Amino acid sequence: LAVQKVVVHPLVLLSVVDHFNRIGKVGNQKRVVGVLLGSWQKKVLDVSNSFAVPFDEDDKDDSVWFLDHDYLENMYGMFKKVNARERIVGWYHTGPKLHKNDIAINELMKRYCPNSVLVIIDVKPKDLGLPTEAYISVEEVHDDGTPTSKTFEHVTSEIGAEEAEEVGVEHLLRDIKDTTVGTLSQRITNQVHGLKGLNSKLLDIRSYLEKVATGKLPINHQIIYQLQDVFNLLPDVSLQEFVKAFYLKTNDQMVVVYLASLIRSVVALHNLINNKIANRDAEKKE
Amino acid sequence: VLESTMVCVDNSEYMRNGDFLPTRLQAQQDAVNIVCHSKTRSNPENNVGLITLANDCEVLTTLTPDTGRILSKLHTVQPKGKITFCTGIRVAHLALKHRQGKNHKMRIIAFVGSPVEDNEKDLVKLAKRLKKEKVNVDIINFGEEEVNTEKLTAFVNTLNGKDGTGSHLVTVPPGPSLADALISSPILA
Amino acid sequence: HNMSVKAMRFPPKSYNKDLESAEERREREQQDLEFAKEMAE
Amino acid sequence: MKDKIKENSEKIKVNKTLPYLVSNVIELLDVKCAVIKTSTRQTYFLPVIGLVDAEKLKP
Amino acid sequence: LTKQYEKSENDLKALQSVGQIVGEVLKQLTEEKFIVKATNGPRYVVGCRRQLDKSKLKPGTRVALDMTTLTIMRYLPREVDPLVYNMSHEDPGNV
Amino acid sequence: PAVDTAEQVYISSLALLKMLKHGRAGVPMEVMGLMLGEFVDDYTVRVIDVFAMPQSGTGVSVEAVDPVFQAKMLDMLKQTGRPEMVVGWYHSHPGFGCWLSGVDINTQQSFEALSERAVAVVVDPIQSVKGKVVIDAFRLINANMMVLGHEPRQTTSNLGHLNKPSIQALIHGLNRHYYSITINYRKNELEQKMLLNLHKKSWMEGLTLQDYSEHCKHNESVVKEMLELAKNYNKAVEEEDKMTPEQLAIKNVGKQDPKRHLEEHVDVLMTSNIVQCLAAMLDTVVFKLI
Amino acid sequence: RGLAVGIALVMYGRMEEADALIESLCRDKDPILRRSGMYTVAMAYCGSGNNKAIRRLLHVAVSDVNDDVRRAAVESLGFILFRTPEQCPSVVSLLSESYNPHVRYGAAMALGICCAGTGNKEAINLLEPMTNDPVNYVRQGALIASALIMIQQTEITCPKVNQFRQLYSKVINDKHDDVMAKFGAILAQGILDAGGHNVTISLQ
Amino acid sequence: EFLHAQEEVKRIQSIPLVIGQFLEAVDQNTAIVGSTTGSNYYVRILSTIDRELLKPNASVALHKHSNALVDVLPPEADSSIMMLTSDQKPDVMYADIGGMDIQKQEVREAVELPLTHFELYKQIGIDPPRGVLMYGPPGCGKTMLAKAVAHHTTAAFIRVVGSEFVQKYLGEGPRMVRDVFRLAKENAPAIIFIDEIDAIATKRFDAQT
Amino acid sequence: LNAKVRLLREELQLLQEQGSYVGEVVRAMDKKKVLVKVHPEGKFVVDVDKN
Amino acid sequence: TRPANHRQLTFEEIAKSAKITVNEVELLVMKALSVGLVKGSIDEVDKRVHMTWVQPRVLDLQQIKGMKDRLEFWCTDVKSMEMLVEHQAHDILT
Ligand SMILES: Nc1ncnc2c1ncn2[C@@H]1O[C@H](COP(=O)(O)OP(=O)(O)OP(=O)(O)O)[C@@H](O)[C@H]1O
Ligand SMILES: [Mg+2]
Ligand SMILES: [Zn+2]
């Protein structure tokens, strides 16, 4: 598509959290909506700033909602005066999931940026996923004969920081972040987190299938198509060729691990030699 | 008075009719030009904005202490779709809830020139909801008043309650120009 | 490797004496006070 | 505006106080701008020339 | 005179300006670090303005750097020596 | 009613990130902006947010505050739940430490004329490194009071003398024309968790296996490197056998250390191969056809 | 800051009865409330030598995001170990050389509180190098602690009394020394000859 | 806290940094460095500086105020003289040059052959010549043979003229000489050509000028 | 480890201390004076440290 | 119909099911391979077709329930291995 990856800077996250908190101080709200400013680098979005805009909606009806687009334009001008290279690239809202009226809001935003990106930023501290979920509006051409509609195609979202922004984040995360853990422990923790995320995704798919089976949701006929491919992609690890290749590869890596460990042991013995010699010299001169 | 207003102009199909000279669309354009000017000279701090009442409501311009932009927006307003009075009033109320200065007073100008295709219960509940937030909605009952004179009657009666002329139901029978009936109406008084 | 690492013994040296000495550190404070009192004026 | 002009001239006089550094105009660029070499053997670029019309300067 | 006030205010705005040291780009180290040599002076590891192109800063490019931070403020065309300018702009005599 | 040295300026995480980003973007201009917050009491100055003022033009210095832009930004921010007054101004010092120049003093005099307890914050985006941002807060010392023989502020606690002033700031008029207010940071659990997502790798790449062709090529290359490294390591051991203690480090200058490179290669290969093996073993269980 | 000391005083000498409060205060996100938890550990275990409270104080001292909380955690060890003054110059001795100046100040103050009036030679030997610490308030705390430890002490009882007596005068009469070091030295002079040489400090 | 201190000590490397030349390592943590300002200083070395990169004649980045050795620049960096790019290669061929077979053979055997056949030279026992001095009457194909070598070489070519080294800034001449040699060493195989060597290689020197 | 940390933190302050000039000794003199030649800056008559 | 472990269709099976001669079976597979309906390869020496992918089709509710049961087993395996990794590497886990 027109968007390959959306990089959301920590300043955007902090601004969104602050906007949500200051609006929610009123004690009666569900979500807040603002505008996202960034630059364009190849096909990778670089969402780097944001500003709040007045917004309200009805709890029952989805067609009733007000967004101050004049406020949008005025603050776009004010921000453009400060930073001309940051242009409107989309919008954000803090609702935990999508809304039925999100397509209308994206249509409103598309005038200012034709390829607008909606970045749902969950203020609640989710334990596994990233707080950002990026979507772009696409015209879904169905093959069932149903008329073409506008949907939100998901986009891989990442959190990246500028050099000074990273410096500030590390200053704010100085105490909390533990960097003493070695690289190997970090990779193993990454594997654990990947297992947890895969379990969560599979549980979401299972819950959707459970709802479909009991009739809570209709058969999409497109999620089923994707799920058949997913189950077909499950490799057979019991094949003789695969097992032999896996064993050969594991032995090829284990011989390297053995060589590295042997060299490490010899170097450790050399260190012990140096320590003992230094201790004996220190006690001999004293 | 220090109040903020938002005009609920109608751009339905029935605005193409030549009942009001020269056309109902041009007639409501002149009426909007008059009412926004009146609200501007009533108080220099007053806020005016334009909300359309097409098939789907679209806030053309939010509240602003400016007049020419309102007519600039109205110039491009083409007659399309069917009136949706239920959602338009709530969209306008949402807009007034986010005015620049909260010390301003509620006010909505409604230009109904097409039949309201809703049950009376929805209208009375909307009127009660607006009355709770002290919202005053002034409705011009031109166009199809022969069918809307009852629903709007209940709307205005429930909005104003029993005391105070917070909102009016100025009904302009077809003639030379409904704007010529506006300057004698309590809307601009 | 673990056995060899666990066999390394550090003699009980007077630690934190290789740091800045009090007299020499005071030297810097006085010279820098003169620096601030003379350059800015 | 006369008082503002006089105060502006007074500020110029404060900034125009002696001594000056004697330099030689090396170059005149457009992006109106000057390049000078001071007698301290230093080359500087001036985005704005200053209190002298750029037309009255030559390398 | 309105134009007199405009010129006086122009002089006032010009007075706040500060000259920039002219050096030459030697080598771009990183995306935000450069090695530049002053025209008659030492070589420095400096930064560059974000708004600068950073693609016109080829090695050997003359640049103007901030006086304090030495950050590359601008890139300039190849300098013409005043002696060379006088050589070119010398009247022969219409012979 | 002398100011207390125990006064503190509380900068929120959003504010700090905004000033750091604006200062780094505006390098080397002394780009300025306004700090919205609240004077909680005589000892606290909370900085809830900041907004940057646009630069009028070229010049590495603080420009005059544009009243129209400030008024417009304040009025519009009040419309979206930010009704916080201006508690002072911030501006960037790209690399020459945190202090106030004469222009900065004149600019801060305006805020002090408006609000007597306004704070001039200086942030050094160039000298700031990860985990330690170079920042300071200042307020002018009135010449009339200090000249007559009065301390600029009263010391009722140790809180105002915990940070030793830098010599660069002292040279530039610190404790003479302006004083430094201790800066503390307000961090909540929510914002810290939100910032923790920075560089947080996706769950997909946790189970993602590296290309086995490139992995084998890397293993072979590093092992071939350790071959030469051990060949040199033997010579290094023999040389250090006969080498005086003054040359233990001087002779190591400019010459590669086979032991250090051997350790680095061992660590790299151990990590890479162990991670690849563990990931493959996990994938053989998770993604199975049965 | 006032309520931090107040809550601790409310539960003075309560042994384990303050535990439910302590775990509430020590787990609080407010650094001042964590400092209050440290002070409550000190007050609820005054001189009991309860190694559970000592363990908690040491854990907070070595691992806490706030320097004030760490300093108070090290400070609170004196109120727990004053009944056995010989133990403090051992548990705290290593803390007295830590990187954190606040932890060093807390170590000095713990020596002062626990070994107050005792004239402990080990604690004074620990405090003597701390009077030359690069950080000013560490020096001030070390001087005040040295005053508390050997208040009223004579030359025969404590051989280092004259040395610190001259040290206080030198620090006070040093124009180039920091103002807070001189504050600590003056407080030390006041403590060392408090009550007209007829008073002491003894929490027991 | 050790990791935090390691991270926070890097603010000493914040730009702008002056450029010096690592002259000598006095001990583990101090060294004599020659700054480009023209003065030699005995400064300290940042503990996180890779001492394996502190080779002789290595460009280093020094703190602008304290002159302390805070970084080591890449050897190919900090060079006022650049190598010949593809577009700068002269169009002169060996075939374009007529009738210098003896000179062509000597240059090839002394320049282009040792670059590609150094192992053969070692095996035979020949010591390859470090440098070549091409001399003769003016206009006898010297500079053109250098052009042909540059056009027909797979190695780096660094063309320079002797009069370029003489500069107003005292110390910049030797600095750029060692920069040329460092750049050639870092891009080995390389050929350094110095046309009109008499500009810096005369036999008479006046000590008072 | 604590000594390593402390030395690392003090190194940042130490590295900001100005570097020392390198000079050549012409001759020693009375009262612990030495005639040196700073590399670019001519000659000086300098004191001698007590160490 | 066949499970992924037994997607090796003999030439006789295709010939009998499609009511075509054996010698034509290969050509039929060619079409199915060319259009993109199925993916795989043909081992003519052993007269077998190694099918590895199928065009996804509309599934009944019972088939969706069976798919959900497969997901149940998959989730059980993923959770078991995640707990195993967490338990074994608890000390080094960050
Ligand atoms: N053998 C040759 N064949 C063809 N042309 C030659 C030959 N030798 C010299 N030339 C001519 O010499 C001209 C340039 O002279 P060149 O620069 O090679 O001389 P040189 O020895 O470097 O002189 P100088 O000592 O004055 O620097 C070229 O135009 C080229 O045609
Ligand atoms: Mg020639
Ligand atoms: Zn400034």
Numbering used by the authors:
A (entry chain Z): 4 to 289
B (entry chain b): 2 to 190
C (entry chain V): 487 to 527
D (entry chain F): 69 to 99, 120 to 147
E (entry chain E): 36 to 130
F (entry chain c): 23 to 312
G (entry chain U): 546 to 749
H (entry chain D): 71 to 279
What do the authors of the reporting publication say about this deposited model?
The ubiquitin-like modifier FAT10 targets hundreds of proteins in the mammalian immune system to the 26S proteasome for degradation. This degradation pathway requires the cofactor NUB1, yet the underlying mechanisms remain unknown. Here, we determined a previously unknown mechanism for substrate delivery to the hs26S proteasome, in which NUB1 functions as an ATP-independent chaperone to trap FAT10 in a partially unfolded state, recruits it to the 19S regulatory particle through Rpn1 binding and presents the FAT10 unstructured N terminus for engagement by the ATPase motor. To determine the structural details of NUB1-mediated FAT10 delivery, we solved the cryo-EM structures of the ATP-hydrolyzing hs26S proteasome either 30 s or 60 s after incubation with the preformed NUB1–FAT10–Eos complex.
Consistent with active degradation, we observed the proteasome in processing states, where FAT10–Eos was engaged by the ATPase motor and partially threaded through the central channel, and in the nonprocessing, engagement-competent state with the NUB1–FAT10–Eos complex bound to the proteasome surface. Nonprocessing and processing conformations were easily distinguished on the basis of the major conformational transitions that occur upon substrate engagement and lead to a coaxial alignment of the N-ring, AAA+ ATPase ring and the 20S core particle. In the nonprocessing state, the NUB1–FAT10–Eos complex showed only weak, unresolvable density that likely originates from an intrinsic flexibility within the NUB1 complex itself and from its binding to Rpn1, which is the most mobile subunit of the 19S regulatory particle. 3D classification focused on Rpn1 yielded ten structures with resolutions for the ATPase motor ranging from 2.5 to 3 Å and Rpn1 adopting variable positions. We chose one representative high-resolution model (~2.5 Å), which reveals the ATPase hexamer with five ATPs and one ADP, in Rpt6. However, despite extensive 3D classifications, variability analyses and refinements of the 19S regulatory particle, we were unable to resolve the NUB1 core, UBA1–UBA3 and the bound FAT10. We assume that these domains get splayed out when NUB1 binds to the proteasome or during FAT10 release for engagement, and high mobility of the NUB1 core may be essential for the FAT10 UBL1 domain to sample different positions during its insertion into the ATPase channel. The high mobility is likely important for allowing the unstructured N-terminal UBL1 domain of FAT10 to enter the central channel of the ATPase motor. Ubiquitinated substrates are bound to the proteasome with similarly high flexibility before their engagement by the ATPase motor, which has so far prevented their visualization by cryo-EM.
